[PDB]
Design a protein around this ligand. Structure first.
Ligand SMILES: CC(=O)N1c2ccccc2NC(=O)C12CCCC2
Lengths: 1120, 19, 393
């Protein structure tokens, strides 16, 4: 039973591919950002960056360049994937439909060749004559760029320089020229070659080869006015052009290496330089003219523009605005001011794009304890570390549909109100005034109002009807006063302004040129609603007057004129539903009973009698629930009012209970402002609470976090954090930034005398590791405990050990030194967070690195390097060794379930152990024998075990049970293979959706969330065999029908890939491809499932229609 | 106000005037 | 370093190190050890032990752990290496040839192999069926090496003492059960300036490219198998040739050629006690690296590469196996002491970085397993080890 469903809940956010140009058209500047498999195109507009089109490559983008061949009006895009799938894309707009087409595609991988150390390099000739690639050592791939080359046929040129650091295409050269920095035993050199397509070879080169600094990194091709190249190594910048040679060694650059570069001026005068520390530099190419004619470089100057996020990209768009593409943190859009500020910096941040970055660790926690989980992840690194929380979800006072504009609608002027008092508020658009009016009375309150026609707003108060206004200026719609009652349990609409007052009641339709008498019979009971529910945008035209009787809520529906109770249908919720209001969706209206305590009832309203429809059950909090239909979109959904209100959203026939993004409200009137429907003037019961599948909250740490663990007993998060500190001979060590560890309410330092077992330089960068106790409400650092010097905390667990009632924070740390390949000393420290202090309990010095720790059965099992240990928490509060397991290289990852243990090795695949309580030591039940270089592990069932490769792959190994009694029971068979394309960092058990009604024969069993280094979160859920076969057939048919953006085969993209083996993917279903079935047009939907057999009702397999398939896909996507 | 940073390239003056 | 790379892996993702792995594994080489139950003695028909010669691991699925070992009496024995039954690991054995067997070559992805022998013949053995598929005949002196390409399982090349490289295709019909060659290179390694101008090692880089080394020629030649060399009455001309990069004036020859997983880098053992590493993709015909410290006195010394191409292991007449990190040839090698005679053949397991099989001239096959941590629970102190890894002086 190994059939899994992998679907990305959150798409990757880290930026690696990156360009700007005229892609969409020849007039609008574009910014193209590639995040792993995602490519997004933005049009630089007046408002800012306008999203235009987001596409998904069937591969990891490694090279993206924008080039304009002669004749083409707009730039074409060259995209190469990590599987060497080169493609050329053109943006083609069809007026309304938006597509990008592949004008040429092809695989460029070679069966012979070692991939280069400096990664894939892809460059385009300035005249667009050819495309150059440096994929393998000793070879240079050249793709001619003729229009005939629809298949991208390339030829390989052999060059003596095997180790090439960076290669660029030069400007101003007649024949195409490459200038590259190569490394040989003599050092590092810069050399130029001329590419001959006719000869398919390398010629002499425009200028000689010169010896450059030993740490030259990358090359910049200066444009025509200057020519030549710029080599920017560590602590040195050089400019080479023929005999012209310039060199500078600025002191500022030497601090950290330059990573990225960009061209600001088209003539090449100014360049932007990134850095590992995030600082942004500007390099100036000063020019001088020789009398007349040629112009030449005069000097090279670099200036520190400021500090930005750690940048994988600098990209000057225009108007002094630079996009900073960050892989280790949030991306930025910053502005280069002409003058600096306090603490002089010319860079000011304008916009921040959220990036989950490297998700080192994460946990699923139910802070609200309602039933829906939340994801708290350790994100970012260095100064970009954060604590993002991912959650799945979507006196002024008064409530009324004030139709000030009969056709424009919305709302201009309102009425404020206290508890028992009210007063019209002069909302003249965006501004308000507080001036008392003589003609009004402010001693009474109004809860519901409405407007009928001619802007006839009438003040409502208990005593009588009085009006001093500007638009109505007349009491035309006079509401009667039988017994002077307040506005309670009354509903009024735009057509009629009626509130529940008195008992001697006749129908209230006092408006010009009509007087209706629908309610004529004497009725003592005070009806909550005496109005009609419109179907759509109709006003005053009710298709039916049937609303049911609040007394019994019988299932059989009775029309109001008949007023005869039909056959009784008792419901479990004998208590009457709190508020029953019809809500009309896009095209569907349903009868919903909003019973606050429980037993919610949903029904479908048919014509006349209406019979009955299906029923649904979803529990809510112990709070009254009010059904509030809101008209602000094409779908006029309803708004619940329970403890956790549900804004139900419509599907074909299955409505989804979306959660609100706020804490809780009781009686709120949403505003239909199209500018920002999310942010409104909403109040609360006593406060003013103002108010996208996933919501991310960022808690900056300014230091790199490692591990996170939740403690519900103390309601706190333990976070392992690392701080980079520069150490100087004077003053000891000084912090670089006021990070989270330094900024703590209370702080402590570890004092362990068992580690008696080195002086660093005056500028060595040391790492100080701390454990931070963080409140779960304010997310502030309550405590910060600093470990010993040269001690790295690798593992953290919060658990209850043995018979001790107390809950402990247990941290595994290793003492690291510059001269040791492997740590030889470690500690397993136990803390108890009693009250604002991290009291230490036990130390337990160990001889190795404690890579991971898991609480087993009330016992702590740790992983010292090449060892798996079991510790007993004795009554003396000291860990005592119980059993050891040595047959491993390093137990990097430990996962447990029951009595079974899963062990991940650095080289070997997962190893499955089993504690034997009788004898009292581990036994190797089975072990996978395929070397896989683990990155994360997870145990799904008692048989299937999930593992993540370091080559962006997933696999599932099954403990064989049908095997005969032999050594063949000791083999874990790799039964499922998949190429995720992302480096999985953490596996966890949980879900981001409501955990209710999960036993109703759901297609997917279990739920595993994995977080990767690119900032994406994915779901793995097991499927049954029949559902797996149906989904595999669906996948094949969709692959046949839909067309990839790069014309890349999906099976090739998803096939398990490694330097040694390329086995096709089995036992895995691509959730993204399955969910993409909903985005294809109806004729294309019928093209799929054309001859597919579906067994829905019973064993018989009818010819499956599109509707059944949509049902299956939507049910699958509910869990996502 | 020197030529160190003044005169940055612009496509059109209205590309970010109302960000 | 290893720990720093592991620690920084989650934050910075993957990186390229110049080999097929993400970690520096140079610190684990001292952990290689051979247990008493991991040492096997090859016995002849008469009863006296015989030295194993030629030994490599299979590539068949779910069978990448069996090891085929040949000796000078023609016996071929298949051992199970991952098995821990603590019994005779020789799960199969049969007399492949009456004379000595000089090379074995597993068919890629299949449980079939080829034994080249001193009967001037090669034999195709179907291991699972325990039957002889056929006999390749046409060599006239003594087969010295046999090679299969990883990209095809029907064409294999045999290099013999007569100086011929004979290319056989199993798809071609056999007249009487005897395979007839599909191609032939005559006088591949001849010193233009008794005869015995033999080719020692033949290896495959592609399905059309072959790398051959001689015994006295001193030049490593590359042949395009698409061309037909049979009709070449004159001396054939190699597509590429790596001349001898050394100051020795003797009749230098190469005893072993090895290609990494990518196939771009070629390691050649030379008689002058050197291992020359060349690049097969670029224009640099000079050796990229030189490894030394061992003694390649005889032509029986052979080398192998780690599964990730990180390390190179080579036998020697020093009676030890030397492991060099490819990235750092200057560093002293790791010595696998324990053999009592010349270490003849070595084989790093392609599917297991942990296992190294060394077949020596003291009638011993030793399986070295990477044991991490010398402090363990009781049971066995000194007898439970017969070889140990130590840093070279
Ligand atoms: C291997 C082989 O059959 N030989 C050979 C064939 C062809 C050419 C040269 C030689 N040299 C030799 O020394 C002999 C002749 C006498 C036996 C050994």
């Amino acid at each position: 039973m190994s059939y899994n469903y992998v679907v990305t809940a959150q798409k990757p956010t880290a930026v690696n591919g990156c360009v700007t140009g005229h892609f969409t058209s020849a007039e609008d500047l574009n910014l193209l950002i590639a995040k792993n498999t995602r490519l997004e195109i933005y049009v630089v507009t007046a408002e800012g960056l306008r999203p235009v089109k987001e596409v998904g490559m069937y591969g990891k983008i490694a090279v993206m360049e924008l080039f304009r061949p002669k004749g083409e009006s707009k730039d074409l895009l060259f995209i190469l994937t990590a599987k060497y799938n080169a493609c050329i894309l053109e943006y083609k707009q069809s007026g309304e439909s938006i597509d990008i087409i592949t004008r040429a595609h092809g695989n460029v991988q070679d069966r012979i060749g070692r991939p280069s150390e400096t990664g894939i390099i892809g460059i385009i000739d300035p005249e667009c004559r050819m495309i150059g690639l440096r994929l393998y050592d000793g070879l240079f791939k050249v793709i001619p760029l003729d229009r005939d080359n629809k298949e991208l046929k390339a030829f390989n040129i052999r060059l003596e320089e095997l180790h090439v650091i960076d290669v660029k295409f030069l400007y101003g050269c007649q024949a195409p020229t490459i200038c590259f920095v190569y490394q040989d035993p003599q050092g590092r050199h810069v050399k130029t070659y001329e590419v001959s397509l006719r000869e398919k070879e390398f010629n002499k080169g425009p200028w000689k080869q010169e010896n450059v600094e030993a740490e030259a990194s990358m090359v910049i091709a200066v444009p025509e006015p200057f020519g030549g190249a710029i080599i920017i190594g560590q602590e040195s910048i050089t400019y080479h052009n023929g005999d012209k040679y310039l060199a500078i060694a600025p002191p500022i650059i030497k601090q950290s290496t330059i990573v990225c570069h960009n061209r600001v001026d088209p003539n090449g005068s100014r360049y932007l330089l990134g850095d590992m520390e995030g600082r942004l530099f500007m390099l100036l190419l000063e020019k001088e003219e020789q009398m007349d004619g040629t112009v030449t470089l005069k000097d090279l100057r670099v200036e520190l523009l400021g500090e930005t996020s750690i940048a994988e990209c600098l990209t000057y768009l225009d108007n002094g605005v630079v996009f900073v593409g960050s892989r280790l943190g949030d991306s930025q859009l910053v502005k280069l001011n002409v003058d600096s500020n306090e603490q002089g910096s010319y860079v000011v941040a304008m916009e921040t794009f959220t990036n989950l970055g490297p998700i080192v660790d994460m946990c699923v926690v139910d802070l609200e304890r309602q039933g829906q989980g939340q994801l708290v992840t350790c994100s970012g690194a260095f100064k970009e570390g954060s604590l993002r929380i991912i959650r799945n979800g979507i006196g002024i006072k008064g409530l009324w549909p004030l139709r000030s504009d009969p056709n424009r609608e919305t709302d201009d002027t309102l009425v404020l109100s206290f508890v028992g008092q009210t007063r019209v508020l002069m909302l003249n658009g965006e501004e308000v005034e507080e001036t008392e009016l003589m003609g009004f009375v402010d001693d009474q309150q109004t809860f519901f109002c409405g407007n009928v026609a001619h802007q006839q707003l009438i003040q409502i108060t208990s005593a009588s009807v009085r009006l001093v206004s500007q638009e109505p200026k007349a009491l035309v719609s006079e509401w009667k006063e039988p017994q002077a009652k307040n506005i309670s349990v009354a509903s009024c609409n735009s057509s009629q302004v009626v509130v529940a007052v008195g008992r001697a009641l006749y129908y209230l339709q006092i408006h010009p040129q009509e007087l209706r008498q629908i309610s004529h019979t004497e009725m003592e009971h005070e009806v909550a609603c005496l109005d009609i529910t419109p179907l759509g945008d109709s006003n005053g035209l009710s298709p039916l007057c049937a609303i049911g009787l609040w007394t019994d809520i019988s299932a059989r529906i009775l029309k109001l004129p008949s007023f005869e109770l039909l056959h009784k249908e008792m419901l479990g919720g004998e208590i009457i539903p709190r508020s029953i209001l019809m809500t009309t969706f896009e095209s569907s209206h349903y009868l919903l009973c909003a019973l606050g305590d429980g037993a919610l009832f949903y029904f479908g309203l048919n014509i006349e009698t209406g019979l009955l429809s299906d029923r649904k059950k979803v529990t809510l909090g112990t709070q009254p629930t009010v059904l509030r239909t809101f008209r602000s979109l094409s779908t006029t959904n309803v708004f619940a009012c329970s403890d956790r209100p549900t804004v139900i959203y419509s599907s074909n026939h299955k409505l989804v209970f979306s959660n609100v993004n706020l804490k809780e409200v009781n009686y709120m009137c949403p505003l239909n402002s199209d500018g920002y429907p999310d942010s409104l003037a909403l109040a609360n019961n006593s406060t003013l609470t103002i108010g996208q599948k996933l919501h991310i909250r960022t808690v900056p740490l300014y230091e790199s976090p490692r591990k996170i663990c939740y403690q519900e007993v103390s309601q706190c998060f333990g976070v392992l954090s690392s701080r980079i500190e520069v150490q100087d001979t004077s003053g000891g060590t000084t912090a670089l930034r006021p990070s989270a560890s330094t900024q703590a309410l209370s702080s402590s330092v570890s004092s362990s005398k068992l580690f008696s077992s080195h002086e660093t330089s005056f500028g060595e960068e040391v790492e100080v590791h701390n454990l931070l106790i963080i409140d779960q409400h304010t997310f502030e650092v309550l405590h910060a405990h600093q470990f010993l010097q040269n001690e790295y905390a690798l593992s953290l667990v919060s658990c209850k050990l043995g018979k001790d009632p107390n809950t402990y924070f247990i941290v595994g740390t290793a003492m690291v030194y510059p001269e040791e390949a492997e740590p030889k000393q470690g500690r397993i420290v136990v803390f108890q967070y009693s009250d604002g202090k991290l009291q230490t309990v036990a130390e337990k010095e160990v001889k190795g690195a404690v890579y991971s720790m898991v609480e087993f059965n009330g016992k702590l099992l740790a992983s010292i390097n090449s060892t798996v240990r079991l510790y007993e928490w004795t009554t003396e509060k000291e860990l005592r060794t119980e059993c050891n397991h040595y047959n491993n290289i390093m137990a990097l990852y430990l996962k447990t379930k029951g009595d079974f243990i899963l062990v991940g090795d650095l080289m070997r695949s997962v190893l499955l152990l089993a504690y034997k309580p009788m004898e009292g030591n581990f036994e190797e039940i089975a072990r996978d024998f395929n070397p896989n270089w683990m990155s994360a592990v997870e145990i799904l069932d008692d048989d299937n075990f999930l593992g993540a490769e370091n080559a962006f792959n997933l696999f599932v190994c099954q403990k064989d049970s049908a095997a005969t009694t032999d050594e063949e029971r000791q083999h874990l068979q790799e039964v499922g293979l998949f190429h995720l394309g992302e480096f999985v960092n953490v596996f966890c058990h949980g879900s981001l959706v409501m955990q209710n009604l999960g036993e109703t024969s759901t297609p997917t069993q279990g739920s595993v969330l994995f977080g990767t280094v690119n900032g994406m979160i994915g779901l793995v859920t097991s499927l049954s065999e029949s559902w797996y076969n149906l989904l595999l057939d669906m996948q094949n048919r969709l692959n046949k029908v839909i067309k990839s953006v790069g014309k890349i085969e999906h099976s090739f993209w998803r096939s398990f890939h490694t330097e040694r083996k390329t086995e096709p993917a089995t036992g895995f279903i691509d959730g993204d491809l399955i969910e993409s079935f909903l985005d294809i047009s109806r004729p294309k939907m019928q093209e799929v499932v054309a001859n597919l057999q579906y067994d829905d009702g019973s064993g018989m397999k009818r010819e499956a229609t599109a509707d059944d398939l949509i049902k299956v896909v939507e049910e699958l996507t509910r869990i996502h | 106000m020197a030529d160190f940073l003044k005169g940055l390239p612009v496509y059109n003056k209205s590309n970010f005037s109302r960000f | 370093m290893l720990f720093n790379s592991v620690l920084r892996q989650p934050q910075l993702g993957v990186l390229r190190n110049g080999w097929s792995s993400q970690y520096p594994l140079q610190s684990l080489l001292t952990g290689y050890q051979c247990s008493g139950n991991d040492e096997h003695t090859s016995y002849g028909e008469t009863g006296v032990p015989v030295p194993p010669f030629g030994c490599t691991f299979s590539s068949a699925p779910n069978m990448e752990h069996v090891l085929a070992v040949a000796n000078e009496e023609g016996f071929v024995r298949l051992y199970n290496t991952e098995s821990q039954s603590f019994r005779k690991k020789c799960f199969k054995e049969w007399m492949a040839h009456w004379n000595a067997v000089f090379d074995l070559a597993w068919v890629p992805g299949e449980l079939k192999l080829v034994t080249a022998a001193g009967d001037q013949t090669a034999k195709f053995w179907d291991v699972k069926a325990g039957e002889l598929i056929g006999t390749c005949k046409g060599h006239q002196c003594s087969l010295k090496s046999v090679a299969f390409s990883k990209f095809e399982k029907a064409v294999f090349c045999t290099g013999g003492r007569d100086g011929n490289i004979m290319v056989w295709d199993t798809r071609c019909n056999k007249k009487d059960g005897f395979y007839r060659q599909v191609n032939q290179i005559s006088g591949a390694h001849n010193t233009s300036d008794d005869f015995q101008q033999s080719v020692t090692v033949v290896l495959f880089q592609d399905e059309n490219t072959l790398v051959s080394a001689g015994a006295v020629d001193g030049i490593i030649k590359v042949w395009d198998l698409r061309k037909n060399y049979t009709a070449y009455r004159q001396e054939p001309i190699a597509s590429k040739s790596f001349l001898y990069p050394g100051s020795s004036t003797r009749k230098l020859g190469y005893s072993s050629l090895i290609l990494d997983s990518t196939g771009s880098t070629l390691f050649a053992n030379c008689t002058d006690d050197n291992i020359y590493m060349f690049n097969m993709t670029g224009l640099k015909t000079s050796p990229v690296a030189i490894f030394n410290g061992h003694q390649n006195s005889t032509f029986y010394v052979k080398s192998s590469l780690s599964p990730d191409d990180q390390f190179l292991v080579s036998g020697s007449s020093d009676e030890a196996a030397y492991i060099w990190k490819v990235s750092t040839p200057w560093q002293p090698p790791t010595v696998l002491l324990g053999h009592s005679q010349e270490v003849t053949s070595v084989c790093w397991c392609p599917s297991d970085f942990t296992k190294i099989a060394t077949c020596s001239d003291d009638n011993t096959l030793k399986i070295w397993r990477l044991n991490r941590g010398l402090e363990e629970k009781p049971g066995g102190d000194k007898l439970s080890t017969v070889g140990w890894a130590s840093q070279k002086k």
